[PDB]
Design an enzyme around this catalytic site. Structure first.
Site, PDB file in Angstrom:
ATOM      1  N   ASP B  25       0.841  -1.200   0.000  1.00  0.00           N
ATOM      2  CA  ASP B  25       0.000   0.000   0.000  1.00  0.00           C
ATOM      3  C   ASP B  25       0.876   1.249   0.000  1.00  0.00           C
ATOM      4  O   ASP B  25       1.332   1.693   1.060  1.00  0.00           O
ATOM      5  CB  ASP B  25      -0.928  -0.042   1.219  1.00  0.00           C
ATOM      6  CG  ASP B  25      -1.948   1.100   1.239  1.00  0.00           C
ATOM      7  OD1 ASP B  25      -1.791   2.067   0.470  1.00  0.00           O
ATOM      8  OD2 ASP B  25      -2.920   1.011   2.023  1.00  0.00           O
ATOM      9  N   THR B  26       1.093   1.809  -1.196  1.00  0.00           N
ATOM     10  CA  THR B  26       1.958   2.982  -1.345  1.00  0.00           C
ATOM     11  C   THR B  26       1.331   4.247  -0.738  1.00  0.00           C
ATOM     12  O   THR B  26       2.042   5.232  -0.491  1.00  0.00           O
ATOM     13  CB  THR B  26       2.315   3.242  -2.829  1.00  0.00           C
ATOM     14  OG1 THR B  26       1.118   3.464  -3.594  1.00  0.00           O
ATOM     15  CG2 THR B  26       3.108   2.052  -3.412  1.00  0.00           C
ATOM     16  N   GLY B  27       0.015   4.224  -0.530  1.00  0.00           N
ATOM     17  CA  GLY B  27      -0.706   5.340   0.111  1.00  0.00           C
ATOM     18  C   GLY B  27      -0.597   5.373   1.632  1.00  0.00           C
ATOM     19  O   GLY B  27      -0.861   6.402   2.257  1.00  0.00           O
TER      20      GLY B  27
HETATM   21  C1  LIG Z   1      -0.319   9.675  11.524  1.00  0.00           C
HETATM   22  O1  LIG Z   1      -0.260   9.407  10.102  1.00  0.00           O
HETATM   23  C2  LIG Z   1      -1.367   9.017   9.451  1.00  0.00           C
HETATM   24  O2  LIG Z   1      -2.355   8.817  10.154  1.00  0.00           O
HETATM   25  N1  LIG Z   1      -1.268   8.894   8.115  1.00  0.00           N
HETATM   26  C3  LIG Z   1      -2.253   8.491   7.114  1.00  0.00           C
HETATM   27  C4  LIG Z   1      -1.917   7.124   6.580  1.00  0.00           C
HETATM   28  O3  LIG Z   1      -0.983   6.993   5.805  1.00  0.00           O
HETATM   29  N2  LIG Z   1      -2.696   6.103   6.975  1.00  0.00           N
HETATM   30  C5  LIG Z   1      -2.475   4.689   6.689  1.00  0.00           C
HETATM   31  C6  LIG Z   1      -1.559   4.128   7.787  1.00  0.00           C
HETATM   32  C7  LIG Z   1      -3.795   3.919   6.745  1.00  0.00           C
HETATM   33  C8  LIG Z   1      -4.707   4.230   5.548  1.00  0.00           C
HETATM   34  C9  LIG Z   1      -4.183   3.742   4.184  1.00  0.00           C
HETATM   35  C10 LIG Z   1      -5.249   3.956   3.095  1.00  0.00           C
HETATM   36  C11 LIG Z   1      -4.650   4.115   1.683  1.00  0.00           C
HETATM   37  O4  LIG Z   1      -4.456   2.923   0.902  1.00  0.00           O
HETATM   38  N3  LIG Z   1      -6.473   3.100   3.233  1.00  0.00           N
HETATM   39  C12 LIG Z   1      -6.421   1.667   3.632  1.00  0.00           C
HETATM   40  C13 LIG Z   1      -6.702   0.714   2.478  1.00  0.00           C
HETATM   41  C14 LIG Z   1      -8.130   0.179   2.526  1.00  0.00           C
HETATM   42  C15 LIG Z   1      -8.284  -0.882   1.435  1.00  0.00           C
HETATM   43  C16 LIG Z   1      -8.448  -0.464   3.882  1.00  0.00           C
HETATM   44  S1  LIG Z   1      -7.949   3.924   3.411  1.00  0.00           S
HETATM   45  O5  LIG Z   1      -7.645   5.382   4.232  1.00  0.00           O
HETATM   46  O6  LIG Z   1      -8.974   2.899   4.277  1.00  0.00           O
HETATM   47  C17 LIG Z   1      -8.646   4.149   1.870  1.00  0.00           C
HETATM   48  C18 LIG Z   1      -9.692   3.347   1.396  1.00  0.00           C
HETATM   49  C19 LIG Z   1     -10.278   3.523   0.140  1.00  0.00           C
HETATM   50  C20 LIG Z   1      -9.862   4.506  -0.756  1.00  0.00           C
HETATM   51  N4  LIG Z   1     -10.429   4.680  -1.968  1.00  0.00           N
HETATM   52  C21 LIG Z   1      -8.816   5.309  -0.284  1.00  0.00           C
HETATM   53  C22 LIG Z   1      -8.236   5.138   0.979  1.00  0.00           C
HETATM   54  C23 LIG Z   1      -2.641   9.442   5.981  1.00  0.00           C
HETATM   55  C24 LIG Z   1      -3.470   8.815   4.869  1.00  0.00           C
HETATM   56  C25 LIG Z   1      -2.870   8.417   3.676  1.00  0.00           C
HETATM   57  C26 LIG Z   1      -3.640   7.844   2.658  1.00  0.00           C
HETATM   58  C27 LIG Z   1      -5.013   7.641   2.777  1.00  0.00           C
HETATM   59  C28 LIG Z   1      -5.630   8.035   3.963  1.00  0.00           C
HETATM   60  C29 LIG Z   1      -4.849   8.613   4.963  1.00  0.00           C
HETATM   61  C30 LIG Z   1      -3.129  10.839   6.313  1.00  0.00           C
HETATM   62  C31 LIG Z   1      -2.850  11.854   5.393  1.00  0.00           C
HETATM   63  C32 LIG Z   1      -3.278  13.160   5.605  1.00  0.00           C
HETATM   64  C33 LIG Z   1      -4.011  13.484   6.749  1.00  0.00           C
HETATM   65  C34 LIG Z   1      -4.306  12.484   7.669  1.00  0.00           C
HETATM   66  C35 LIG Z   1      -3.866  11.174   7.445  1.00  0.00           C
END
Ligand SMILES: COC(=O)N[C@H](C(=O)N[C@@H](C)CCC[C@@H](C=O)N(CCC(C)C)S(=O)(=O)c1ccc(N)cc1)C(c1ccccc1)c1ccccc1
Ligand SMILES: [Cl-]
Ligand SMILES: [Cl-]
Ligand SMILES: [Cl-]
Lengths: 99, 99
Positions: B25-27
């Site tokens: 998960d690059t995101g």
């Molecule tokens: C303290 O640091 C943080 O909390 N950083 C955040 C972060 O990386 N969080 C990751 C550990 C966890 C979320 C990773 C993220 C994507 O695949 N997801 C998980 C994958 C699904 C299939 C379960 S998700 O948030 O549920 C998601 C689900 C569906 C869609 N279309 C897009 C995103 C980070 C974030 C990055 C990417 C998406 C969501 C949040 C963030 C950025 C800006 C402000 C607050 C938080």
């Protein structure tokens, strides 16, 4: 290009003639952008995240350029922390993971 | 390998003597796994994104094997709907996005 992951893989996208910054996100099934205006009709969609589910607006067949590569596909609009380019458009631009 | 994005990029990992399936998960800034036990000290942390925030336990200096490549790093444990391998460990196996 080849993008390493030491920092967030943020790229510039162009949509509705405007530039935005967006995250190349292989963990996301779908592309989800922060609140914006898009043309045409939308349909309801639920997506699940790390924190639970949200309602988003689903726009189909939207023109979007991602790091210089043109795509036309589904864009969801709703309360996302960052603009996210998901697998539905990463596949359009020919993106793969490699190690 | 070269992993396409037509499907979720799920791979087998080995952690704490258990084999699990996880999403590359690059995101994701951080690696987050469904509830499990891990050795040593931990501290609470909140991680956020789509849907809002969840509370997790943060374990540092944890050995993981990802798709046959060894890495060490921080592993968060909590109510994630899917096991996620985030950038903190993707970098260690030399994972890149390419298009
Ligand atoms: C303290 O640091 C943080 O909390 N950083 C955040 C972060 O990386 N969080 C990751 C550990 C966890 C979320 C990773 C993220 C994507 O695949 N997801 C998980 C994958 C699904 C299939 C379960 S998700 O948030 O549920 C998601 C689900 C569906 C869609 N279309 C897009 C995103 C980070 C974030 C990055 C990417 C998406 C969501 C949040 C963030 C950025 C800006 C402000 C607050 C938080
Ligand atoms: Cl699409
Ligand atoms: Cl780490
Ligand atoms: Cl590197």
């Amino acid at each position: 290009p080849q993008i390493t992951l030491w920092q967030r893989p943020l790229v510039t996208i162009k949509i509705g003639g405007q530039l935005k910054e967006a995250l190349l996100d292989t963990g996301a099934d779908d592309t989800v952008l922060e609140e914006m205006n898009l043309p045409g009709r939308w349909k309801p969609k639920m997506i699940g995240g790390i924190g639970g589910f949200i309602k988003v607006r689903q726009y189909d067949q939207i023109l979007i350029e991602i790091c210089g590569h043109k795509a036309i596909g589904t864009v969801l609009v709703g309360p996302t922390p960052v603009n996210i380019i998901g697998r539905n458009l990463l596949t359009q631009i020919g993106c793969t993971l490699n190690f």
